[PDB]
Amino acid sequence: ELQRREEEANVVLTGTVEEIMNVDPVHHTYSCKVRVWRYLKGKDIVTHEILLDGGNKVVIGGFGDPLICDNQVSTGDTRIFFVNPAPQYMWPAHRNELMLNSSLMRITLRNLEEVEHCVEEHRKLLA
């Protein structure tokens, strides 16, 4: 469910796929260059852990991941991406990449509002 997906993704962002990158032969996945529009969660994590390209381009890996339902993209696609910075054990292959953690979501106000609500709910710890 969304609550779990949001909980397991330290970074959630919206963007459009600009280019399909290289395949990870060992893990059967591929990466893509994505132009970020807005961050719904974890902008600070990206800011401190990812070297952005051109100010708003990030490389997301993990596409094709057999364990993720909606895991494919084509150039021009726009989605809400649930990701986590690639851990070092995934380096060098995925160094500086955000890794897909769960299914890609379409850009609709409903999805935007719903994801934002889960992020906010979870953020509300003190409040």
From Swiss-Prot:
Residue intervals of the NtA domain: 1-127
Marked site positions, Cleavage: N111, L112, K124, L125
Glycosylation, residue list: N101
Function: Is involved in modulation of growth factor signaling. Involved also in the regulation of neurite outgrowth probably due to the presence of the glycosaminoglcan (GAG) side chains of heparan and chondroitin sulfate attached to the Ser/Thr- and Gly/Ser-rich regions. Also involved in modulation of growth factor signaling.
Name of the protein in its database record: Agrin N-terminal 110 kDa subunit
Gene: AGRN
Residues of the full protein shown: 30 to 156 of 2081
